[PDB]
Design a protein around this ligand. Structure first.
Ligand SMILES: Nc1ncnc2c1ncn2[C@@H]1O[C@H](COP(=O)(O)OP(=O)(O)OP(=O)(O)O)[C@@H](O)[C@H]1O
Ligand SMILES: [Ca+2]
Length: 425
DNA sequence: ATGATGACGCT
DNA sequence: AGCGTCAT
C-alpha cells in the first residue's frame, strides 16, 4: 500500500514523425502534397518496393513492403517519389538529414534519445518542474492543449469528443499540488504541444506524440491518435487500456517472447498478466523478462531515456535476391567496394560533424538458403577512412567462406559493412 | 524478390 | 567474439 511504488516518478514523451519519408518528399515537391502517395525503393522489379505511405493512400490499402505495381492496383492514382540511388544502392541521406533537422529542434526542449530515424524519446521531468514553478497554481487552459487526447476520456464529431475528454480531465486536476503525477503529465503535454508546433513551424513536418510516465507507455500512447495528434496516457488509465490490449502491441513483445507469453500462459491481453506472481513470470521467461513483465503489466517501467542523439554504429547494406545473388569473386569485390565507398562518405561526414572516429569494421554476409538476417559476421581493424582499404579488408575477412571457384559458391544474397567502436577525436 | 539500418541480449 | 531478437 504505502510502500508500493507506482511508476509515476518521470514524465516521458515519444515523438514519431508521421509518414516521414513521404513528408520529406512532399515538402520538396508540392505536387505531392495532400495526395495519395508513396515513397519507393528501386524500380525495375515490380515497380520498386514501397517504404512509406501517405495517410490518403493508406485508405486504399497501400502498405509498406508492397510492390508499387501492386499498390497501383489498389490505388490507380497513387503518386510516387523514388529514393535516391547511388552506386547501385538506395541512399537514404536526404531522410537522415531531415531527421537531424527535427532532432536538433527537439533537443532545445530536453535531453532526447534517438530511437530510430524518425522517433525520439524525451525525458521532460525537469522541464515540467521548472514550468510548474513558473506557473503559480494557475489553471491549465484547454487552449494550451489543442491537439491532445486524454486516453480513456470522455467517460458525435471527432474533435468534439476530444474536447469533451480534455474538459473532463482538466476539471479534476489538483492544480495546487506540485507533486501530482497527473498534473505533471498535463504540463508535459503542454510542452510537447510547444515542441510539435516548433517542429512544424521550422521544418514543415507534422508528428504524433505520446506522453506518459515511461517509454513503453509513451510509445503506446503515441500510436493511439495518429496522425498529427498527441495522446496522454495517465497511470490511472492503464487498467482499462491494458484490459483489451493485445500483448504484441507492447514494445519488445511483438516477436517470439510475446508469442510465448500468450502460448505458455494462455492469455491474450496485457492486463491478464497481473494475475501471476513475479516468481511465476520469472520461471517461464527468465529473471529479467519476468521482473519486467510483472512491473510493465501494472504500467511500471524504469528503462531510462538515454542521452544519445547520434547512432553508435554507421552501416551500409544491400540485398541481392534470387538470380541476382553474387556468384563470382569479381562481383563480390565490386559490391564491397560500392558499399565501402558510400560508408567512407558517411564516416568522413560523421568525423567532421561529430568529432569521432570509428575503430572497428564489421563485415556481415548472407548465403543463399538461410532464412536468417545474417549468415556470418567477422570484424577487423578500421584504421583509415579509405574505401579501397575497407573493401579489401572486408574481402580478406570473408574470403575463406567461399567453397570453391573465379567463382563464389554458395552465392551471396546480402553484403553488410558496419563501422563501430567510435572514439572521440 | 523486401529493403536499409540500428540497439541490445546471450554466450 | 559471433549469433539472435526486436524495432523503425
Ligand atoms: N520494415 C522496415 N524496413 C525498412 N525500414 C523501415 C521498416 N519499418 C520502418 N522503417 C524505417 O523507419 C522509418 C519510419 O517508419 P514508421 O514505421 O515510423 O512509418 P512512417 O512512414 O513514419 O508512418 P507512421 O505515420 O505510421 O509513423 C521508415 O521511413 C523506414 O525508414
Ligand atoms: Ca513514423
Amino acid at each position: 500500500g504505502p510502500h508500493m511504488a507506482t511508476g509515476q516518478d518521470r514524465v516521458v514523451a515519444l515523438v514519431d514523425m508521421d509518414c516521414f519519408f513521404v513528408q520529406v518528399e512532399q515538402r520538396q515537391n508540392p505536387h505531392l502534397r495532400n495526395k495519395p502517395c508513396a515513397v519507393v525503393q528501386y524500380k525495375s522489379w515490380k515497380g520498386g518496393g514501397i517504404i512509406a505511405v501517405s495517410y490518403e493512400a493508406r485508405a486504399f490499402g497501400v502498405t509498406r513492403s508492397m510492390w508499387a505495381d501492386d499498390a497501383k492496383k489498389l490505388c490507380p492514382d497513387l503518386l510516387l517519389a523514388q529514393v535516391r540511388e547511388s552506386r547501385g544502392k538506395a541512399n537514404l541521406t536526404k531522410y537522415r538529414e531531415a531527421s537531424v533537422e527535427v532532432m536538433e529542434i527537439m533537443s532545445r526542449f530536453a535531453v532526447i534519445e534517438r530511437a530510430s530515424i524518425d522517433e525520439a524519446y524525451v525525458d521532460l521531468t525537469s522541464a515540467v518542474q521548472e514550468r510548474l514553478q513558473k506557473l503559480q497554481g494557475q489553471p491549465i487552459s484547454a487552449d494550451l492543449l489543442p491537439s491532445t487526447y486524454i486516453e480513456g476520456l470522455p467517460q458525435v464529431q471527432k474533435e468534439g469528443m476530444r474536447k469533451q475528454g480534455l474538459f473532463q480531465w482538466l476539471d479534476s486536476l489538483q492544480i495546487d499540488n506540485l507533486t501530482s503525477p497527473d498534473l505533471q503529465l498535463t504540463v508535459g503535454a503542454v510542452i510537447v504541444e510547444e515542441m510539435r508546433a516548433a517542429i512544424e513551424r521550422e521544418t514543415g513536418f507534422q508528428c504524433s506524440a505520446g506522453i506518459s510516465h515511461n517509454k513503453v507507455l509513451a510509445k503506446l500512447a503515441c500510436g493511439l491518435n495518429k496522425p498529427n495528434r498527441q495522446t496522454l496516457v495517465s497511470h490511472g488509465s492503464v487498467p482499462q487500456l491494458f484490459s483489451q490490449m493485445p500483448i504484441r502491441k507492447i514494445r519488445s513483445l511483438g516477436g517470439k517472447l510475446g508469442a510465448s507469453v500468450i502460448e505458455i500462459l494462455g492469455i491474450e491481453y496485457m492486463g491478464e498478466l497481473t494475475q501471476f506472481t513475479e516468481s511465476q513470470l520469472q520461471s517461464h521467461f527468465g529473471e529479467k523478462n519476468g521482473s519486467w513483465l510483472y512491473a510493465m503489466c501494472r504500467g511500471i517501467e524504469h528503462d531510462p531515456v538515454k542521452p544519445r542523439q547520434l547512432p553508435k554504429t554507421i552501416g551500409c547494406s544491400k540485398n541481392f535476391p534470387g538470380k541476382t545473388a553474387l556468384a563470382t569473386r569479381e562481383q563480390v569485390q565490386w559490391w564491397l567496394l560500392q558499399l565501402a565507398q558510400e560508408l567512407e562518405e558517411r564516416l568522413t561526414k560523421d568525423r567532421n560533424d561529430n568529432d569521432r572516429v570509428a575503430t572497428q569494421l564489421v563485415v556481415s554476409i548472407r548465403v543463399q538458403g538461410d532464412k536468417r538476417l545474417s549468415s556470418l559476421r567477422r570484424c577487423c581493424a578500421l584504421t583509415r577512412y579509405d574505401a579501397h582499404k575497407m573493401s579489401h579488408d572486408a574481402f580478406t575477412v570473408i574470403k575463406n567462406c567461399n567453397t570453391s571457384g573465379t567463382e563464389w559458391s554458395p552465392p551471396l544474397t546480402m553484403l553488410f559493412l558496419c563501422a563501430t567502436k567510435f572514439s572521440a577525436s
